[PDB]
Amino acid sequence: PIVQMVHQCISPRTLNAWVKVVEEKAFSPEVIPMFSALSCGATPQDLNTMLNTVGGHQAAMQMLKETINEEAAEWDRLHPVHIAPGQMREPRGSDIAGTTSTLQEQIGWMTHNPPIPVGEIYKRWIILGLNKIVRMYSPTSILDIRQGPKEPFRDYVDRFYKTLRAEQAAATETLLVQNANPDCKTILKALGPGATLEEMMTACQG
Amino acid sequence: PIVQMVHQCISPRTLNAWVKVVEEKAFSPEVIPMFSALSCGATPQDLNTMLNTVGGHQAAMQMLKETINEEAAEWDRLHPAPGREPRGSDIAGTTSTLQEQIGWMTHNPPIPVGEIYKRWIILGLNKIVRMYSPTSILDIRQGPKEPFRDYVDRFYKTLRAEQASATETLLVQNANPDCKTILKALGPGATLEEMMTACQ
Amino acid sequence: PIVQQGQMVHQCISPRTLNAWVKVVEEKAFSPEVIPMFSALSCGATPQDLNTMLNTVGGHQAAMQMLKETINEEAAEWDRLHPVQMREPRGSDIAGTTSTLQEQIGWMTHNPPIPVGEIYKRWIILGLNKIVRMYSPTSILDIRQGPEPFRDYVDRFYKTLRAEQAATETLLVQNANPDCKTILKALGPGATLEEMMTACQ
Amino acid sequence: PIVQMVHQCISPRTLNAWVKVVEEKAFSPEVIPMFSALSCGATPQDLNTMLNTVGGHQAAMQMLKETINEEAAEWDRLHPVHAAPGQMREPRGSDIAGTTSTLQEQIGWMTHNPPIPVGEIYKRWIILGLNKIVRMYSPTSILDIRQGPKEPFRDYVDRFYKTLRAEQATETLLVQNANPDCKTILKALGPGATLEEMMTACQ
Amino acid sequence: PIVQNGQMVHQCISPRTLNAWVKVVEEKAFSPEVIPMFSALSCGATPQDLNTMLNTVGGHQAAMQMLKETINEEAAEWDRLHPVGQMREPRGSDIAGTTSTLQEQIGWMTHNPPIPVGEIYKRWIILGLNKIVRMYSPTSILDIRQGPKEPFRDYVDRFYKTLRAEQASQATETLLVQNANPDCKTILKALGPGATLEEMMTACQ
Amino acid sequence: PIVQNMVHQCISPRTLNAWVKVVEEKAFSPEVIPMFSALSCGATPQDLNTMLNTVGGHQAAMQMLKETINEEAAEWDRLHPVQMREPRGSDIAGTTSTLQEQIGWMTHNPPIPVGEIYKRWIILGLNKIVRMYSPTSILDIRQGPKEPFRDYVDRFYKTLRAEQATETLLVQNANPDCKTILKALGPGATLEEMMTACQ
Numbered sequence A: 001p002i003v004q005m006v007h008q009c010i011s012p013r014t015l016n017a018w019v020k021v022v023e024e025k026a027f028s029p030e031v032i033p034m035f036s037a038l039s040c041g042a043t044p045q046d047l048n049t050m051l052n053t054v055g056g057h058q059a060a061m062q063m064l065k066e067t068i069n070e071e072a073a074e075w076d077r078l079h080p081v082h083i084a085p086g087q088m089r090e091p092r093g094s095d096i097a098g099t100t101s102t103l104q105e106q107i108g109w110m111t112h113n114p115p116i117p118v119g120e121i122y123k124r125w126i127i128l129g130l131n132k133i134v135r136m137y138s139p140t141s142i143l144d145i146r147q148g149p150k151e152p153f154r155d156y157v158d159r160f161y162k163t164l165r166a167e168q169a170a171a172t173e174t175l176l177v178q179n180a181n182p183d184c185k186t187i188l189k190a191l192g193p194g195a196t197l198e199e200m201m202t203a204c205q206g
Numbered sequence B: 001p002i003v004q005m006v007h008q009c010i011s012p013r014t015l016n017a018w019v020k021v022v023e024e025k026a027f028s029p030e031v032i033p034m035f036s037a038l039s040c041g042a043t044p045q046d047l048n049t050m051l052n053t054v055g056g057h058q059a060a061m062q063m064l065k066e067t068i069n070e071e072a073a074e075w076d077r078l079h080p081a082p083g084r085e086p087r088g089s090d091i092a093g094t095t096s097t098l099q100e101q102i103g104w105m106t107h108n109p110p111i112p113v114g115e116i117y118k119r120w121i122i123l124g125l126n127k128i129v130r131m132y133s134p135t136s137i138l139d140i141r142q143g144p145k146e147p148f149r150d151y152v153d154r155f156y157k158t159l160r161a162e163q164a165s166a167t168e169t170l171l172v173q174n175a176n177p178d179c180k181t182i183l184k185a186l187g188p189g190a191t192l193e194e195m196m197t198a199c200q
Numbered sequence C: 001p002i003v004q005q006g007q008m009v010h011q012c013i014s015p016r017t018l019n020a021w022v023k024v025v026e027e028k029a030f031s032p033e034v035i036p037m038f039s040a041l042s043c044g045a046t047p048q049d050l051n052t053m054l055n056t057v058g059g060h061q062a063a064m065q066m067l068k069e070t071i072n073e074e075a076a077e078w079d080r081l082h083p084v085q086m087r088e089p090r091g092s093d094i095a096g097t098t099s100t101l102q103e104q105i106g107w108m109t110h111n112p113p114i115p116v117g118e119i120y121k122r123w124i125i126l127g128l129n130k131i132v133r134m135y136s137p138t139s140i141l142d143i144r145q146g147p148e149p150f151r152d153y154v155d156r157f158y159k160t161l162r163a164e165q166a167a168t169e170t171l172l173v174q175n176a177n178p179d180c181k182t183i184l185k186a187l188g189p190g191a192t193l194e195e196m197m198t199a200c201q
Numbered sequence D: 001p002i003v004q005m006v007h008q009c010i011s012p013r014t015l016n017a018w019v020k021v022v023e024e025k026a027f028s029p030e031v032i033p034m035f036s037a038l039s040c041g042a043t044p045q046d047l048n049t050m051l052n053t054v055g056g057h058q059a060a061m062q063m064l065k066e067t068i069n070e071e072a073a074e075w076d077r078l079h080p081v082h083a084a085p086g087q088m089r090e091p092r093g094s095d096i097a098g099t100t101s102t103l104q105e106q107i108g109w110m111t112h113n114p115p116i117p118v119g120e121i122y123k124r125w126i127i128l129g130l131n132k133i134v135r136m137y138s139p140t141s142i143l144d145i146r147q148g149p150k151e152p153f154r155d156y157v158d159r160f161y162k163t164l165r166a167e168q169a170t171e172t173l174l175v176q177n178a179n180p181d182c183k184t185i186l187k188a189l190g191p192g193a194t195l196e197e198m199m200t201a202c203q
Numbered sequence E: 001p002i003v004q005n006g007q008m009v010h011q012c013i014s015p016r017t018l019n020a021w022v023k024v025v026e027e028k029a030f031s032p033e034v035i036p037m038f039s040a041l042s043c044g045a046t047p048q049d050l051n052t053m054l055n056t057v058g059g060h061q062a063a064m065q066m067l068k069e070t071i072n073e074e075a076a077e078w079d080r081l082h083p084v085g086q087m088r089e090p091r092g093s094d095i096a097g098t099t100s101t102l103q104e105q106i107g108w109m110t111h112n113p114p115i116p117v118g119e120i121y122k123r124w125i126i127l128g129l130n131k132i133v134r135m136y137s138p139t140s141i142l143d144i145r146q147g148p149k150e151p152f153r154d155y156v157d158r159f160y161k162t163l164r165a166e167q168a169s170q171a172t173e174t175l176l177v178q179n180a181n182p183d184c185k186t187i188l189k190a191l192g193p194g195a196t197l198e199e200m201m202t203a204c205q
Numbered sequence F: 001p002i003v004q005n006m007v008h009q010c011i012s013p014r015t016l017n018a019w020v021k022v023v024e025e026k027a028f029s030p031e032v033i034p035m036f037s038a039l040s041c042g043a044t045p046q047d048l049n050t051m052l053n054t055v056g057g058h059q060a061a062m063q064m065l066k067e068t069i070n071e072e073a074a075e076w077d078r079l080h081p082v083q084m085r086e087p088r089g090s091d092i093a094g095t096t097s098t099l100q101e102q103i104g105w106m107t108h109n110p111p112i113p114v115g116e117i118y119k120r121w122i123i124l125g126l127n128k129i130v131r132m133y134s135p136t137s138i139l140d141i142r143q144g145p146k147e148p149f150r151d152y153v154d155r156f157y158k159t160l161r162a163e164q165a166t167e168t169l170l171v172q173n174a175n176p177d178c179k180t181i182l183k184a185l186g187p188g189a190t191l192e193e194m195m196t197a198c199q
């Protein structure tokens, strides 16, 4: 990454943390924030390093390459560029993705005045592709998350919003009630409209 | 976090510590202090990062969002130049940038948007702890062969979960007879150490 | 904590220290050697830090209530001896319940320093010693050598003695088994411990 | 390594990380990036240290030595050396490979004005040889990766691109090797289907 | 401990150092190789730090009392050999950290010229630890003999491990040959005076 | 050790534990020797002795190492006989020199690298020990009838590495199905070629 504005080597802890997150959690949605936090201050070279250290899930990694190329093409459309000697150049899509730019070029853009934040732009493209992958690898739809006959209400709400988080990559208490089991459904409808989640779960912890 | 005043990337150790305390302890009450310690100096962005790295307990996290919106609404209710004042959603990091948060937290006078957001978050977490307390204090009663120490442990762990923001009278009433008589005979004003020694 | 431009600043408590403390409590309960570890882990701690460390303990809530009791006793005695734009800290200020972090830093870094962190740590360790003594599973009088290596018996004797006092070798000889008791009596009164264990191995 | 420019001792964490990734992953392709990251800023001495701490896989390390000598010979051809009281010398292949150069000489080149990145050049040679080894230890060819009659399309694409990565140390071959249930669907999708689209089709 | 940064400052002892010491005592007890680790873990230690490390040991309380005995003996001899706003002169119990404050220890350790109370206390502690190492040696060098099928190298390992424990206090080859089994003993005897250890081990391999 | 921020620094718990672990887990396999050198980066002689002394086992090896050290110290005294003084063998080995003296030598201008010299002696002795504890001779590494060529080459060069503390013996000791292929390859064949052919 880069820090203070000086480039810093990616740490063995950060590298291992990421590889382990991917090994342990695959593309569950909570992997996306960790990546963003682990890639705090990352140059594009560092981001490519992090992606490449993942050994498995190579289908997902190919899809990710596709999404990155879609964003790079849209970048070339939105901010077309032409260089003068002794002066730096403006980055195009393949430059933000680190395939045609050097480390020094990335550092120059990221620490220039005004700064051109190629690391954040690349990270946004990467998270866009990751969100697509998380949504795709979601095992079941939100319409199919229904409370079982003896399933504790808390566990059902856990499943409901975990699925919603994967599928949103809103505040559907109506589907939540509709998909609750009959006893809980009767109680929740009698609770009234505008009931918060705490109220719904307290009403149904029996 | 903002440290000594420059911004620092959230550390892998902190991230892992938080994820692990949630994985290993769920919402036992001692998880809230750890969050506060792990989020020392956190910007709102950092706090959102820590919350989002939690993979389970999404019911609790929705409840937490609800509480946060209640606190943000009260902030806007009570606290309504080219080159701005923070609203509720700004302190919660949903409508503010990192740079804006740094500006508020690092200023004279400082505007502690990180501490304000953390306070709202801890209010909601305490609520969640209260919800996940399996038994009320009225049901914490000493067993017939249960050591007094173990009963007091359970009693105050439950009391702590139910009071997430003379406790030795209910304690005596709920103690088993063999120990209740001794405690009653100790008299008024006995400390906990004295009560526990008497029933050792 | 408060750590030393070469001057003292406030630092966030580290995940390693927090985890070390939580782990030591999980693994060792209130064995006496938990108190040294705490003192080292709370090196330079503000009262806020000390309360943070205590609050991360999840179990043993009886002991922690007992600890609060001891803290209130020490805070009352502080108020008795030191009655009272920076202000002098009272008992509840040293215990971190009515003082802010900035107030604690100000007291701790004044010239001359008012060591509210060390004083609070002293109260906390006083209460912890009470808990260690109370939770000692055996009295020293019941530690007697079996028909058991002298070294193991002395280990038990002084581990129990350490818990119970939170110290005489006469009891050590009295409670030893006769095989070693004859040797110890013949050794001469005034024998060191090395001489006793070296003698009857 | 050289760090923001000073010399730093190689860290125990980096040494252990490298030894562990080699023990756990052998020469799977994702070992080469890790090496590059663990050797960020490494001098040639540091690179040799990391390589030498590997205890097994001595066939691969001898092959790597062969590749290093091949690159050193090409360096000497295209960047000849001529034979400076107090002044500094031009690096040959074996100096960049750390076999005839001292630590201070490596520091001098890497920290010169203009800098001569002998560490990056040596690292490039090392990664060329490692890629050759990864290719050698690849267990299957891309021609032999075919979808099973009950294999989820996602798992087959995983195997396909993992093998492709080891070999290149595509959608047409991907469809051709798919099972008929999936092949018919993919063919009906029409040309130009993206991977996301294809995988959704055969989900 | 005390460590340079441009001025010698006190730094809090780290959780890593504390854990390393407690774990090595738990895992290795008082085998001779624990004493170097302590010295390394107590690099730059003040007497307070050394006492902290010692006090974190939960077991082996017999050994810790024995250690206390040695420390008091050294402190009394210190008071003999160096009879005792400005800095006071340190006595035995000051170097042992029982009657001196942390600030006093820093003053002595950082005075010009320095009075190294931390190194002196560490020396007393290692002397006592060496006594404990000798006591907890399970067997004497006279009782280490190779069995009829024990590889010579393993036997020499046992022999010198015992020698290291027993000689932890302030000619190795002859007993080594004498206690070897006849099979290797004959070879070594035929080798000649002045055989190196490598030569002996090769001869019996 | 002695590093630049040029002061003495306390040895870190990571280095101590790393060394003890690599010795416990790998004994004197050759790849321990680089690890030691890397773990002792910037070490004073005192530090090197610390690392050696923390090893609890292998006391035969440690005496053998001591033997090699005394031979090197004697050769130093013969080559380089003797305010600031010149270091002798026992000074470089840390038995008669203080820490402050070692720092003076290591940080003088010009530097007297007592740490590098002592490390050289220690690694020389370690190489002898590594060679001795190699279980089999290179002449005895022969390809099995059903043994994959890659595994045989792995063993061959691991043994060669333990014995050096290339083409003809490798082919000669291969099994005949692979030996015939290798012989037909001709001279000058690289290892990569030999291994792809026999896969």
Ligand SMILES: COc1ccc(N(C)C(=O)[C@H](Cc2ccccc2)NC(=O)CN2CCN(S(=O)(=O)c3ccc(N)cc3)CC2=O)cc1
Pocket: A161, A162, A163, A164, A165, A166, A167, A168, A170, A171, A172, B048, B049, B051, B052, B058, B061, B062, B064, B065, B068, B069, B072, B092, B093, B094
């Ligand atoms: C004022 O409140 C706020 C405060 C901060 C944030 N900020 C900026 C975040 O970054 C939050 C951090 C956060 C995380 C947990 C609890 C509280 C807060 N991040 C998410 O909340 C991610 N997240 C979003 C997808 N899903 S969902 O199931 O699709 C979903 C379900 C219901 C609804 N109504 C919408 C989405 C849930 C989830 O945990 C957001 C809101």
Ligand SMILES: COc1ccc(N(C)C(=O)[C@H](Cc2ccccc2)NC(=O)CN2CCN(S(=O)(=O)c3ccc(N)cc3)CC2=O)cc1
Pocket: B156, B157, B159, B160, B161, B163, B164, B166, B167, C051, C052, C054, C055, C064, C065, C067, C068, C069, C071, C072, C075, C095, C096, C097
């Ligand atoms: C003077 O003594 C003090 C010193 C410091 C504090 N400070 C600031 C804290 O931060 C304390 C830390 C603490 C922890 C253990 C021992 C001592 C101290 N911690 C809480 O104050 C929160 N806390 C308070 C009770 N609860 S309870 O069981 O609900 C409960 C039980 C009985 C009653 N009557 C009411 C509530 C558990 C808990 O986590 C507080 C008191």
Ligand SMILES: COc1ccc(N(C)C(=O)[C@H](Cc2ccccc2)NC(=O)CN2CCN(S(=O)(=O)c3ccc(N)cc3)CC2=O)cc1
Pocket: C158, C159, C161, C162, C163, C165, C167, E051, E052, E054, E055, E061, E063, E064, E065, E067, E068, E069, E071, E072, E096, E097, E098
């Ligand atoms: C001898 O010179 C000195 C030097 C330093 C100290 N200082 C300041 C300490 O901090 C010592 C450090 C220490 C620790 C272990 C071994 C040696 C030394 N440690 C304690 O003082 C705590 N401590 C006290 C309770 N018990 S005990 O079993 O009840 C016990 C039973 C009988 C007797 N006579 C004493 C104690 C043992 C213990 O480890 C003290 C004395």
Ligand SMILES: COc1ccc(N(C)C(=O)[C@H](Cc2ccccc2)NC(=O)CN2CCN(S(=O)(=O)c3ccc(N)cc3)CC2=O)cc1
Pocket: A048, A051, A052, A061, A062, A064, A065, A066, A068, A069, A097, A098, A099, D161, D164, D165, D166, D167, D168, D169, D170
């Ligand atoms: C899309 O935007 C970019 C951004 C950055 C990169 N950069 C510079 C890399 O470095 C990529 C990082 C990377 C990783 C995942 C997603 C996106 C990016 N990292 C590699 O390792 C490339 N890479 C991946 C294996 N393959 S392949 O499987 O043989 C292979 C597969 C398909 C085809 N058509 C050909 C070969 C070899 C290879 O060169 C590349 C693309």
Ligand SMILES: COc1ccc(N(C)C(=O)[C@H](Cc2ccccc2)NC(=O)CN2CCN(S(=O)(=O)c3ccc(N)cc3)CC2=O)cc1
Pocket: E160, E161, E163, E164, E165, E167, E172, F049, F050, F052, F053, F059, F061, F062, F063, F065, F066, F069, F070, F073, F090, F093, F094, F095
């Ligand atoms: C020039 O050579 C030297 C170089 C350096 C040292 N220095 C200062 C040390 O620190 C050495 C370090 C060391 C450790 C292991 C291998 C090599 C080196 N370590 C000890 O000197 C302590 N040490 C001493 C003997 N014992 S022994 O087995 O009792 C023993 C065995 C045989 C005989 N004849 C006597 C005693 C084991 C031990 O750990 C010493 C001598």
Ligand SMILES: COc1ccc(N(C)C(=O)[C@H](Cc2ccccc2)NC(=O)CN2CCN(S(=O)(=O)c3ccc(N)cc3)CC2=O)cc1
Pocket: D048, D049, D051, D052, D058, D061, D062, D064, D065, D066, D068, D069, D097, D098, D099, F157, F158, F160, F161, F162, F164, F166
């Ligand atoms: C090729 O260009 C170079 C580049 C760098 C180096 N430098 C300075 C080293 O430090 C090398 C680093 C190194 C290590 C592995 C692969 C590549 C590189 N390290 C060793 O050379 C140690 N080493 C020692 C001999 N043995 S061997 O198996 O006994 C053996 C080897 C060769 C023959 N002909 C016979 C036996 C294995 C080994 O890895 C040397 C050469």
